[PDB]
Design a protein around this ligand. Structure first.
Ligand SMILES: COc1ccc(-c2oc3ncnc(NCCO)c3c2-c2ccc(OC)cc2)cc1
Length: 272
């Protein structure tokens, strides 16, 4: 009943996506901020319709909250939780990474978000530091469900076959096999994200037989970069995640039992 609370000012561009751009909107009355993802549809309808649908299913503290959407002509609007900390990508110093206690905390929160999605039968399919945003308290939130899909419905798993994602994060089976299980693919990409956080570099362009850096890993040459920059404990976890055979790859229940994952490293937030 308050006269102007449906009014938002568009205060700046947060960035450009393929679809279009994202602008920071601020309520004229409350000063609440939200991100507005703008998707130029004459530039596709299949992508955004499913993205919205999937967003309506989601409610979790480590997943960017979906507030709504409007069609306003040929433009789709998605109203989303504003994550003022920006991309996890920007917290990774090239060639260095970040402090191991920060990397562990981000990884904990990433697993909590991924457990949530998988528990409701959704696979994100493009996990990478660009899509892991950070709120004002540096809490990690999984964003962009534009490539997400259902892998479980009525308690029945469906195998995937659409190739998608981003090559350096993509699991080797998605390049080698016609069909593959969804969950190990997201586990793999989380491993590449962990590697990036701890070494400040991606291990290979793609996990194919034709990629020298990938062969080196499969030959256990961890005296090379990026592996040499990583302490033995997290590296042991990475040996379990970055396993070529997805049926042998560690699952998330088992990641939660891993020694590094459970290693005390980090004290509270600066006077919490
Ligand atoms: C410090 O600079 C920035 C830049 C972007 C953002 C940002 O905050 C967001 N909150 C919600 N969604 C967001 N993006 C859409 C998917 O959910 C953002 C972003 C943002 C927006 C666009 C972008 O493209 C480069 C990268 C990050 C936050 C801070």
């Amino acid at each position: 009943a308050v006269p102007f609370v449906e009014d938002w000012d568009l205060v700046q561009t947060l960035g450009e996506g393929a679809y279009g751009e994202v602008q920071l909107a601020v309520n004229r009355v409350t000063e609440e901020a939200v991100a507005v993802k703008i998707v130029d549809m004459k530039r596709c309808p299949e992508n955004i319709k499913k993205e919205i649908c999937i967003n309506k299913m989601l409610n979790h503290e480590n997943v960017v909250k979906f507030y709504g959407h409007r069609r306003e002509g040929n433009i789709q609007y998605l109203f989303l939780e504003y994550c003022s900390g920006g991309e996890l990508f920007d917290r990774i110093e090239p060639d260095i990474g970040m402090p191991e206690p920060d990397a562990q905390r981000f990884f904990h929160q990433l697993m909590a978000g991924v457990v949530y999605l998988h528990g409701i039968g959704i696979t994100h399919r493009d996990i990478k530091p660009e899509n892991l945003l950070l709120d004002e308290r540096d809490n990690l939130k999984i964003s962009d469900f534009g490539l997400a899909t259902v892998f479980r419905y009525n308690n029945r798993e469906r195998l995937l076959n659409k190739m998608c994602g981003t090559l350096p994060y993509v699991a080797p089976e998605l390049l080698k096999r016609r069909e593959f299980h969804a969950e190990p693919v997201d586990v793999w990409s989380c491993g590449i994200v962990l590697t990036a956080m701890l070494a400040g570099e991606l291990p290979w362009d793609q996990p194919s037989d034709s990629c020298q850096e990938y062969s080196d890993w499969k030959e256990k040459k961890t005296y090379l970069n990026p592996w040499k920059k990583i302490d033995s404990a997290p590296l042991a976890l990475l040996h379990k995640i970055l396993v070529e055979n997805p049926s042998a790859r560690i699952t998330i229940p088992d990641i939660k039992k891993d020694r590094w994952y459970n290693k005390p490293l980090k004290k509270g937030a600066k006077r919490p």
